[PDB]
Structure 1
């Protein structure tokens, strides 16, 4: 326990007992891939092609949800990297 921290990086326990054991070399590239996929899904559902009732595409929607997620994945990747993991 003791999620409180004062050093350079928080302890790996703040990532939960599922991300605490992911190597940073896995989280990092996974975070970048998720960010790219989410940005592309957002730019394909909108921006590049205007949205319409007949075109919603749960893949692009679910995808776009990987952009907010990506943020968390690379934050966890940095936390793991600084904690020698």
Structure 2
């Protein structure tokens, strides 16, 4: 009815090809697939190590390992972005 507003810079990212366009990665649209895959492997290793350091959780956990544990769910989005950039010719 009335025009539905969107934030400035909103583009059409609907895709039916093998992979989405790189624009779905937002600020990471210019990162190569190799960099994404390497960062995903490194993020998995660091997140798993930090998590395994904090699995017997105490009342005084190390803040650094707590911060580093969040890289383990980050690595999933990283390998998805790696697949996207690899199938986008990047």
Whether TM exceeds 0.5 here: the answer is: yes
1:7 is matched with 17
Following superposition, which runs of at least 4 residues in structure 1 exceed 4 angstroms of deviation?
Answer: none
- State whether structure 2 residue 85 is matched by structure 1 residue 76: no
Please tell me whether Structure 1 or Structure 2 has the larger radius of gyration of its CA atoms. Answer: 2
Any gaps of 5 or more consecutive residues in structure 2?
1-10
Match of 2:43 among 30, 34, 54: 34
Give the number of the structure whose residues are more often helix, by fraction. Answer: 1
Q: What's the TM-score once normalised by structure 1's chain length?
A: 0.89
Structure 1 residue runs without a partner (length 5+): none
| CA-atom RMSD in angstroms | 0.9
1:25-64 equivalences under 5 Å are: 25-46=34-55, 50-54=56-60, 56-64=61-69
Aligned residues: 80
Looking at structure 1, the residues matched to 52 and 82 of structure 2 have their Cα atoms a distance apart, in angstroms, of 25
* TM-score in terms of structure 2 length: 0.84
